[PDB]
Design an enzyme around this catalytic site. Structure first.
Site, PDB file in Angstrom:
ATOM      1  CE1 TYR A  59      21.760  49.737  11.883  1.00 38.94           C
ATOM      2  CE2 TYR A  59      22.514  52.558  11.771  1.00 38.94           C
ATOM      3  CZ  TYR A  59      22.194  50.596  12.459  1.00 38.94           C
ATOM      4  OH  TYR A  59      23.167  50.322  13.928  1.00 38.94           O
ATOM      5  CG  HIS A 118      25.199  45.031  11.466  1.00 35.99           C
ATOM      6  ND1 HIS A 118      23.885  46.320  10.530  1.00 35.99           N
ATOM      7  CD2 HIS A 118      24.709  45.879  12.381  1.00 35.99           C
ATOM      8  CE1 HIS A 118      23.272  46.732  11.266  1.00 35.99           C
ATOM      9  NE2 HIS A 118      23.988  46.961  12.865  1.00 35.99           N
TER      10      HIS A 118
HETATM   11  N1  LIG Z   1      26.001  46.723  15.780  1.00 34.41           N
HETATM   12  C1  LIG Z   1      25.092  46.956  16.276  1.00 34.41           C
HETATM   13  O1  LIG Z   1      23.934  46.007  16.373  1.00 34.41           O
HETATM   14  C2  LIG Z   1      23.750  48.680  17.160  1.00 34.41           C
HETATM   15  C3  LIG Z   1      22.566  48.289  17.284  1.00 34.41           C
HETATM   16  C4  LIG Z   1      22.073  48.633  18.096  1.00 34.41           C
HETATM   17  C5  LIG Z   1      22.945  50.262  17.924  1.00 34.41           C
HETATM   18  N2  LIG Z   1      23.772  50.561  17.647  1.00 34.41           N
HETATM   19  C6  LIG Z   1      23.992  51.477  17.203  1.00 34.41           C
HETATM   20  O2  LIG Z   1      24.380  52.467  18.395  1.00 34.41           O
HETATM   21  C7  LIG Z   1      23.289  53.702  18.199  1.00 34.41           C
HETATM   22  C8  LIG Z   1      23.016  53.494  19.977  1.00 34.41           C
HETATM   23  O3  LIG Z   1      21.670  52.583  20.163  1.00 34.41           O
HETATM   24  P1  LIG Z   1      20.139  52.534  20.781  1.00 34.41           P
HETATM   25  O4  LIG Z   1      19.783  53.818  20.153  1.00 34.41           O
HETATM   26  O5  LIG Z   1      20.423  51.377  21.746  1.00 34.41           O
HETATM   27  O6  LIG Z   1      20.877  53.098  21.967  1.00 34.41           O
HETATM   28  P2  LIG Z   1      21.006  54.918  23.231  1.00 34.41           P
HETATM   29  O7  LIG Z   1      22.644  56.041  22.874  1.00 34.41           O
HETATM   30  O8  LIG Z   1      21.071  53.979  24.438  1.00 34.41           O
HETATM   31  O9  LIG Z   1      19.003  55.406  23.573  1.00 34.41           O
HETATM   32  C9  LIG Z   1      18.854  56.095  22.576  1.00 34.41           C
HETATM   33  C10 LIG Z   1      17.553  56.997  23.092  1.00 34.41           C
HETATM   34  O10 LIG Z   1      17.850  57.648  24.146  1.00 34.41           O
HETATM   35  C11 LIG Z   1      17.089  58.568  24.413  1.00 34.41           C
HETATM   36  N3  LIG Z   1      18.716  59.528  24.745  1.00 34.41           N
HETATM   37  C12 LIG Z   1      20.173  59.642  23.976  1.00 34.41           C
HETATM   38  N4  LIG Z   1      20.943  60.695  24.442  1.00 34.41           N
HETATM   39  C13 LIG Z   1      19.476  61.269  25.890  1.00 34.41           C
HETATM   40  C14 LIG Z   1      19.823  62.346  26.827  1.00 34.41           C
HETATM   41  N5  LIG Z   1      20.939  62.595  27.018  1.00 34.41           N
HETATM   42  N6  LIG Z   1      19.202  61.709  28.330  1.00 34.41           N
HETATM   43  C15 LIG Z   1      17.499  61.289  27.806  1.00 34.41           C
HETATM   44  N7  LIG Z   1      17.493  60.770  26.804  1.00 34.41           N
HETATM   45  C16 LIG Z   1      18.493  60.508  25.876  1.00 34.41           C
HETATM   46  C17 LIG Z   1      16.965  59.179  22.698  1.00 34.41           C
HETATM   47  O11 LIG Z   1      16.493  60.257  22.257  1.00 34.41           O
HETATM   48  P3  LIG Z   1      16.156  61.012  20.730  1.00 34.41           P
HETATM   49  O12 LIG Z   1      17.218  60.355  20.141  1.00 34.41           O
HETATM   50  O13 LIG Z   1      15.244  61.734  21.404  1.00 34.41           O
HETATM   51  O14 LIG Z   1      17.120  62.475  21.840  1.00 34.41           O
HETATM   52  C18 LIG Z   1      16.841  57.681  22.127  1.00 34.41           C
HETATM   53  O15 LIG Z   1      16.100  57.233  22.597  1.00 34.41           O
HETATM   54  C19 LIG Z   1      22.162  53.365  16.753  1.00 34.41           C
HETATM   55  O16 LIG Z   1      21.480  54.575  16.376  1.00 34.41           O
HETATM   56  C20 LIG Z   1      23.349  53.057  16.588  1.00 34.41           C
HETATM   57  O17 LIG Z   1      23.824  53.537  15.301  1.00 34.41           O
HETATM   58  C21 LIG Z   1      24.469  49.351  16.691  1.00 34.41           C
END
Ligand SMILES: NC(=O)c1ccc[n+]([C@@H]2O[C@H](COP(=O)([O-])OP(=O)(O)OC[C@H]3O[C@@H](n4cnc5c(N)ncnc54)[C@H](OP(=O)(O)O)[C@@H]3O)[C@@H](O)[C@H]2O)c1
Ligand SMILES: CC(=C\c1ccccc1)/C=C1/SC(=S)N(CC(=O)O)C1=O
Length: 275
Positions: A59, A118
């Site tokens: 990250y 990961h």
């Molecule tokens: N192990 C892995 O391979 C892996 C892969 C992908 C992700 N991850 C982890 O999971 C986390 C989440 O992943 P993601 O970013 O794909 O998923 P997510 O939480 O489904 O989507 C994030 C998006 O949702 C928005 N959001 C969050 N809360 C909201 C709400 N209450 N209303 C409207 N929009 C909202 C955010 O906007 P804002 O940010 O502008 O609030 C952002 O654009 C990552 O940061 C990471 O730590 C891990």
């Protein structure tokens, strides 16, 4: 306030919402331009109760961990649950231990609470990787180990090759992405004391019209947003915790309130049927 669930069979409860950090301090490469703003956002999240922090060496090219490292100094280390992850290029013994050392240097802490593979690398024997992670546990550098993006069959394989308990499997899971259901992975976790950690729990807000019509009715009835309903749906499931990315205060606040929503049995059955 924050819902807590037991991690694996550890006897320890963790926040059922993690703080996702992908994008903070850059994506694949470091972004230094908003460092002060990002440290302040992390501090605000932690103070609101987001003490479970999900990061990775990949990250921001390492810079996300550096920003977390500054933010956590305003708090007591033992009150935080910090998760990091080793990239699949680094799963050989000496590379993994170096990745771990460098992650601890960037976080500027003496241990991580949870260290994950990961993504799998089929070229590198799992027994080697898991034995290297056990060396970190034995040295006090890691409290718990787990895996990420392991399907049921590979999680089973990891459990058979690991000296230490595998406490979790972090996979993509949301109202539209049901691979963990179809794979038998969620059932396996629930029957074998493994926490399923759902990343992309809002599917990055990219949903279909059909999903949206069902979520809208349920949201209206709870005075909630469709995204709060998506999180409540995941958190209603045994062994499931979620890691939303909320890069703004409005979403941190909204997602935390989602932990208070009590979905009915018929609402759960309707939501279950959307995939
Ligand atoms: N192990 C892995 O391979 C892996 C892969 C992908 C992700 N991850 C982890 O999971 C986390 C989440 O992943 P993601 O970013 O794909 O998923 P997510 O939480 O489904 O989507 C994030 C998006 O949702 C928005 N959001 C969050 N809360 C909201 C709400 N209450 N209303 C409207 N929009 C909202 C955010 O906007 P804002 O940010 O502008 O609030 C952002 O654009 C990552 O940061 C990471 O730590 C891990
Ligand atoms: C763009 C999709 C990616 S790539 C990448 S690394 N991550 C975070 C993660 O996998 O832990 C993403 O969410």
């Amino acid at each position: 306030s924050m819902l807590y669930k037991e991690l694996g069979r550890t006897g320890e409860e963790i926040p059922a919402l993690g703080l996702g950090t992908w994008g903070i301090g850059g994506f694949e490469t470091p972004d230094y331009s908003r460092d002060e703003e990002m440290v302040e956002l992390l501090k605000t999240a932690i103070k609101m109760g987001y003490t479970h922090i999900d990061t990775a060496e990949y990250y921001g090219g390492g810079h996300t961990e550096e920003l977390i490292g500054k933010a956590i100094k305003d708090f007591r280390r033992e009150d935080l649950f910090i998760v990091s992850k080793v990239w699949p290029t680094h799963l050989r013994r000496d590379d993994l231990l170096r990745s771990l050392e460098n992650t601890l240097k960037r976080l500027d802490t003496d241990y991580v609470d949870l260290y994950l593979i990961h993504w799998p690398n089929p070229e590198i024997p799992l027994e080697e990787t898991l034995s290297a992670m056990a060396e970190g546990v034995r040295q006090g550098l890691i409290r718990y180990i787990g895996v990420s993006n392991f399907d049921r069959r590979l999680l089973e394989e990891a459990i058979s090759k690991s000296q230490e308990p595998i406490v979790c499997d972090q996979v993509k899971y949301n109202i539209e992405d049901r691979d963990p259901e179809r794979d038998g992975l969620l059932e396996f976790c629930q029957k074998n004391g493994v926490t399923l950690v759902a990343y992309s729990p809002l599917r990055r807000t990219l949903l279909s019209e059909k999903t949206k019509r069902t979520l809208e009715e349920i949201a209206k009835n709870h005075g909630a947003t469709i995204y709060q309903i998506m999180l409540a749906w995941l958190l209603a499931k045994p062994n499931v915790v979620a890691i939303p990315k909320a890069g703004r205060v409005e979403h941190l606040r909204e997602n935390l309130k989602a932990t208070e929503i009590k979905l009915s049995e018929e609402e759960m059955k309707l939501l279950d049927s959307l995939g």
